[PDB]
Point group: D2
Chain length 469, copies 4
Amino acid sequence: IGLDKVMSLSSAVQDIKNGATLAVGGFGTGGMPHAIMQEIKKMGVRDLIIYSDGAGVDGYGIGVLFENKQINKMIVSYVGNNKIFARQYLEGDVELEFCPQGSLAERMRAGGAGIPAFYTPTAVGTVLQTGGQITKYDKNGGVLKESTPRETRFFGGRLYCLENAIKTDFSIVKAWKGDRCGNLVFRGTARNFNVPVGQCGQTVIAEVENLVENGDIDPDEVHLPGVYVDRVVVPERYQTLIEHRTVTRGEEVRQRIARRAALEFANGMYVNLGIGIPTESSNYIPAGVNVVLQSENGLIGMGPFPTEDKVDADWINAGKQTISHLAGSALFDSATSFAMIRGGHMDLTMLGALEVAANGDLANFMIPGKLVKGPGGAMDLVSCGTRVVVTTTHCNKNGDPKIVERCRLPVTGKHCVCRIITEYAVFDVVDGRLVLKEIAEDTTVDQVKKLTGVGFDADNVITMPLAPL
Amino acid sequence: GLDKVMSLSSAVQDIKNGATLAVGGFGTGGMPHAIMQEIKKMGVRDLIIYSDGAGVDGYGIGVLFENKQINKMIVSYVGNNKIFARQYLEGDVELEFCPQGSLAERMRAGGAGIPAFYTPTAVGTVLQTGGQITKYDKNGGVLKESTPRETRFFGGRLYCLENAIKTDFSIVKAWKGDRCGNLVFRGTARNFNVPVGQCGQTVIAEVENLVENGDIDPDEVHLPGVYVDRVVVPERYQTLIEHRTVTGEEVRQRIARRAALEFANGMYVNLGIGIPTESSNYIPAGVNVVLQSENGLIGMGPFPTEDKVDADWINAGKQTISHLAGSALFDSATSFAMIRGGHMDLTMLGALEVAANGDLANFMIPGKLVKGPGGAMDLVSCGTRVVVTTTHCNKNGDPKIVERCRLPVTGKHCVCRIITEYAVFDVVDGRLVLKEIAEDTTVDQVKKLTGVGFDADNVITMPLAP
Amino acid sequence: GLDKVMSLSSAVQDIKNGATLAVGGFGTGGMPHAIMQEIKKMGVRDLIIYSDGAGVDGYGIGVLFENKQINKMIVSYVGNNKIFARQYLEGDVELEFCPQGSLAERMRAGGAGIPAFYTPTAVGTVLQTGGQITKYDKNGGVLKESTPRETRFFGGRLYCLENAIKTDFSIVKAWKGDRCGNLVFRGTARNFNVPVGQCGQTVIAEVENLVENGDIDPDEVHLPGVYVDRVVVPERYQTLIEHRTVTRGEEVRQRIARRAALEFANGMYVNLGIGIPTESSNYIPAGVNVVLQSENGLIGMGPFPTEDKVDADWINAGKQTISHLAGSALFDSATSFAMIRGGHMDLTMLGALEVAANGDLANFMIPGKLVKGPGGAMDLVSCGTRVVVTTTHCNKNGDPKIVERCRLPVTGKHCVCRIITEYAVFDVVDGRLVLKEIAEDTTVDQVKKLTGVGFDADNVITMPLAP
Amino acid sequence: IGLDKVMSLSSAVQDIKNGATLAVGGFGTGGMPHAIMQEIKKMGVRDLIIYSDGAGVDGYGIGVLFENKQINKMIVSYVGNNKIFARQYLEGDVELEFCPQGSLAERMRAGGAGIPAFYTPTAVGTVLQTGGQITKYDKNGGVLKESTPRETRFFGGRLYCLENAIKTDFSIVKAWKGDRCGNLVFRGTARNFNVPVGQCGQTVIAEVENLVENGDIDPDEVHLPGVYVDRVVVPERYQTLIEHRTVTRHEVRQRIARRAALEFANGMYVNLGIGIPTESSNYIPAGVNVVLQSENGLIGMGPFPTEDKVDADWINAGKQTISHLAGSALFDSATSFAMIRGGHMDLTMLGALEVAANGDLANFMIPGKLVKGPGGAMDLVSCGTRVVVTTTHCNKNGDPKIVERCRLPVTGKHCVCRIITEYAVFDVVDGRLVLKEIAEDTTVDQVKKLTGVGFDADNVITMPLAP
Ligand SMILES: [Ca+2]
Ligand SMILES: [Ca+2]
Ligand SMILES: [Ca+2]
Ligand SMILES: [Ca+2]
């Protein structure tokens, strides 16, 4: 009975003109409007400017659009496993502007919310603040364009970046269910950027896996109120591409690092755990320590990999791996997820590092002119203000220390690491300098001196304990 | 998993003298009344409370007024609250008004690690410049005034800087919660409970129904459990319904009948109480509008039928309401992101004064009728077409249409059309131009009945909606 | 060694229609009248001019109104300029007011590569909120209003953002210049010529005296030649003296002056507004030695000169010829308002149209009726300094000048420390009036009836008056 | 006649209590109140915080206070030839905060002027904006403290740093002449920071080489108006230490200097830094008349003076004694950096440790080994003036100096236009290099292996030299 916003897929997309700015939902392939992307490929519109968490993958969602070089510029938090995207960045076909994930989500929200700008501690003192990130090459490996700096201001004695609202000509979203007046319901972690994206475009287009009538969706269950949606399309049903089909049915220093990291958890903690050693450590949490895992793409209550029967493209973790959920879990959008993180609602954040400094700076982020992926949610995670523990092997395989006085590699966050756990040692960062807290059963203080690239205090060292099985 | 469930007394025993509280609710809807009663019993004093309003007499935050436990209220609207209004005027309580959209988003920003953000809301008003009376001494004289807000230009337009709100406690009421704190709300009782939920160091949630972890669908959780520290399951009670609305005035009918012709098909509209709301009842033959209510609903309907009355389903004026097919519920941060982002096609409100400049005064007259800005400051300043509906002259013979406002401005350069029982005006180039007239008074007699001059060359006759 | 010397005509010929100018001068003093004359001759139109004032009728900038060569004025003061005020009222001219101290510092900031800076001046006035009428239509209807200034807090108090001023030309006048453009000024005719000289793309100076390079002591140079593009030597002419003041009934005025005179203490540096505050400097008691600051760039200002020591280059803030005393010092207008905005005055005494229990003051303009401008008063009242208002207690007609809240546009918000009248001396304490003294053997009861607000009156003494 | 502020040296200084913030005039030893620093040593005040352009020199001025550990913290632009200073920072007894010279001076003025903050392009994108310069060590050479970041904002599409006003308990100043009022007159380049230092202190103490009576300083010749000065001291006569008594009496760098000499052109105002840029001044051909600027407050700087005209008050930026030419002009350091920051130089020619194809420049820090501070280099590079770098093609270690991206901490970002070496001349175009000229018949493949990057050579000529 109500408003009817339904259109065919070609008709909904036909007025996107050359040069249009798009905001696109999706986290990797989860909630990525591939059907609509396939249709905009068909119409052949050129030099698009696209704001999205990533650029999908080779042959999927936004990834489709690189094939006939339809993309001028991507503004993105991560490139991920997208070879055509990286190749077109490196070969000078595409401008690539990085934005930390949480800032990208809040900027889109802001543009929908009539907020022209807001402050965040994210990216402060990084190259995303100072400018000079390589955004465009020429045709012959030469730097053609560089990122513009961010402005900064102090509040309460801490420094923050000014972020500007993002407003687009079009927004493209995917949802599990929509009604005819454009109310959208999402499923699992495929929600993600689809809420902030739907709010920031002048013309918003939603593909729905299920169209229902007005009044079929409980108003209390609506995730994106129909006011935001202009056009709804019902593509023929298709299987969302699963990047990492992870299911439940060497050099194991990693297990030792994970077993010590496991002693960091306390009962009742909410935790965000990075790919690798941090996640592994969750397997060694003792009985009587109940912690809830958060996934930055919009879950708390994250469980281990699903059993075969539970494998679901809508339920993946930050590394695009298929995931389960536990009793009392809860889904939220990407803006809420980074509000959660930025607002320091995690009790523990556990991350890897390529290099970590005595002052508590750390570098993963990138290596310039080299293997360059993007900030992802790493910059928001570390600037949370919350307890950050780094779990990493003590040295590079060639001997070079990963624990330094100050970072040579570009900084992910400034003065944010509290504790460094390696196979040899546990260091606290106390007043911008290092204190050796623990050493492994029969190493010595003397060898850890030699394996770390800075001095430290060692006036009260204990043996490093490990959690069992 | 987690069990955060707790007695009423234990949940609240840690609240000390001087504590700051952010408290959910819109009027009585979603107001954690039971927790407020407990706070009264424990007898803490010098509370500083942030909330949309302060409940009503005998209900919610209202009950804490009667033994003078409240030092300062930061509020959008006083509402139907006599003890609150009384204590402000007599100097027992300090009152800072915050526009409702700004209050909700400052709480969210508090929860989200965003120390400040810009909004066009309240620019050029007393809420930006300072000089609203926030405290009186005990003989009518001014003790304290509101501090100015900073301003900054973006794209040639001026915005107010709003600061994050963080409280010692936040207090929240939900329809359902599980043991680990996940909340689901019902109807428009959601409102501020989500942003309030996010901004407190210690967050306490009163639930109407407790369920076990895993009874709530993860996709139906409105406040994730990470935000809640303490859940309490009070003795079940009914939410107080302020106005149980169920299915010589002619001046308000004709203005509402002319104002219904402003509705075009497919519009999303926010109506004020009084004349703008009654304009909906004359929505013409083939015009589909969707009504927004600032407390967190699109698809608002007429008053419910007697047996379908529901205390969680109320409009801005605190009346029981229904929902139409395709309705959607959302929290107050989202409500004002919708409004401040220009997602309404029309907002229609009333006035104490409206200028030829486009200025509108409609939120207080100093020392006499002080209600607060409500959502009105947001509604006027978001670039949405604003049509004011009001009787041509006030309850003297003085024109409610003046050259420049003398009462405190709700917003500047914002009214697009003005509709009265005798005339209709448009604001062009910061000045008044007569586009319609009916009841059939000529230009000269209305021209004397208004407080300003005006252009009047393409004047047609004013129609009415049947 | 450079030679920037040119004819008057060739120097000015490059000013195209719509050019923006910054122009030196305070009133007539240091106003480049010979160049302004030339700009009239060549007939350029739609000028945008920044200057302290706009000259006077028939002199300096005022000359340019005769042929409607001015589109927009940005000034602090209209002054004795009837064409100006009139052309504003009847829609020929756009007029934007800027506090004098802000105007000087914005010019310098424009010269100094500072895009913006913060000042307390004008905070909470019409000049920061927007809504001063900058342009009328031809029927006295409002066409344009001033745009708001941004504001930020520092150290718990609010400040206005001011933007740099950079103009197509700057026009300055000096007593002396060499061929490479070093300028030396005389008396208070320096004023805006320094910052004006810094902010122009093409800066032209008229000099009363041209000398060779090496003839000016490098230590006596006021505007370094690097700043000056073109130097002009007009045929010599007498600077217009507005008020040739010399040494040789309603006398409420003299009782107020005599009470205000008791506000002075030994060692004070003081700025006194025109009227009663200046008259009070006549009744300064015997052991009290003060230095008077004149906002156009003088400390050590003395009384009017003798008949044959009159000097057009030495005038006070009200454009009157004046002397200087032993140990006096001249400075330019940026410096002058750095002095003031910096709190270096010990007392500032001002008149009022209206003064509030609040401590607000209104004394600079009344929309559509008095076109004056803020002058230096906004700067004077909003720096750290003690402000005393000397005013008649009531209007002529009997309405109070001491009100609860200002109805006229406020010069400063919460700034007045003491109010002295013929009846009374009120202090402003915690945002309300406390009566401290009353006159004569008048009564608390008559002053209650004469004041537009209530007040505290629990330690009222009798009002003393200097000898 | 007037006020009297004269005091003895001991009494003027005795109420400086421990933990006191001082602002001190002087540039090297020029205009530095040495006698007062001496007396302050006598009194034994502890834990001082000092804002000054430098910290004098061993045994001279602020340097006299490092001997008995009297200084907690220095806020400085340049440490410059001060071994006790550099040593106490390194081992960890003195906290050292670097501030760009122009920013330092304007912050002090701002403190004097009631301007809480202002913006400037100086230091944007450097370690002085981002934080992470070492400001205090411990005993074992680890970082106890880092500088806190500067905040930043866009105006007109360009990023500026926010600078905070400096106000101190005391300001110590030296002047050539003062009266009893406190009106000061400075001499030569000994003015420098003394004007803005004199404005920004609660209590300001001035040592005068010459005391005169009120009325003996022409009011038009006063450089610091007496309002700013609280106490005037007249030490026993003493000679200002000359660091470099350079005088005019009766080969790799010569080639660069002769090419650099061609950059000059008639009418230019030019700032030359120490080394090859100052050398290039010697070879200006023809009737090419330039005017040389010294950042310490001179335009019209000439060669090293003849023996009998050396004067401690007339020094360049490298603290060398200097002559001045016809048309010269002196001004204080706030004005100097307004002149520089406001783009009033046509050419600034500088040295480099590294220059990038980017156009970035590193010339002020090399971590651990040379940590003397930004001086005025950051102000000179970010003011939009045409900047030209003169440098040897390689290090003392044989490494290349034209690199891709600076390894060393940057003085300025995308600032350099032309790079001049003995081997070649590059232009920075579109954010990368482009070789335009070579000399000695060495060719486009000989320089490529000697420069640290590739570059463009689409239209190359050979390098002309001044005779
Ligand atoms: Ca739309
Ligand atoms: Ca909590
Ligand atoms: Ca010029
Ligand atoms: Ca002083």
